[PDB]
DNA sequence: CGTCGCGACTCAGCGACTCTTAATCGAAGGTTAACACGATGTTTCCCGCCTGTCAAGGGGCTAAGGGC
């Protein structure tokens, strides 16, 4: 809801795709791996 | 009553295939008449058809925001 082209049409498909990959809606630190320390 | 006329006979003789089984390193040298059209390929561009860009335009579908 902060930028355009992010309405209700595509609001849960991206979250489902991210969860299927192995991650989830959060469950980590905000901007934790934002440096080259955990780069791979 | 002998042999030889005439026959086979096996004996020699002459030719001829392989060199275990895995492995130590890759290729390897000569022979030196002249010319001519013709039919036969060889090689270059050149357009023909066609294939492939991205763009322009547009609409139609999908979706997101605002109002009652």
UniProtKB/Swiss-Prot annotation:
Functional description taken from the UniProt entry: DNA-dependent RNA polymerase catalyzes the transcription of DNA into RNA using the four ribonucleoside triphosphates as substrates.
Gene name of the record: rpoA
Portion of the full-length sequence here: 291 to 330 of 338
UniProt similarity note: Belongs to the RNA polymerase alpha chain family.
Lineage: Bacteria, Pseudomonadati, Pseudomonadota, Alphaproteobacteria, Caulobacterales
Organism encoding this protein: Caulobacter vibrioides (strain NA1000 / CB15N)
UniProt superkingdom: Bacteria
Disulfide bonds: none
The record's note on its domains: The N-terminal domain is essential for RNAP assembly and basal transcription, whereas the C-terminal domain is involved in interaction with transcriptional regulators and with upstream promoter elements.
Oligomer and partners: Homodimer. The RNAP catalytic core consists of 2 alpha, 1 beta, 1 beta' and 1 omega subunit. When a sigma factor is associated with the core the holoenzyme is formed, which can initiate transcription.
The protein, known as: DNA-directed RNA polymerase subunit alpha
């Amino acid at each position: 809801l902060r930028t355009p082209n992010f309405g209700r049409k595509s609001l849960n498909e991206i979250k489902e795709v991210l969860a299927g990959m192995g991650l989830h809606l959060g469950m980590d630190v905000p901007n934790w791996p934002p440096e080259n320390i955990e780069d791979l």
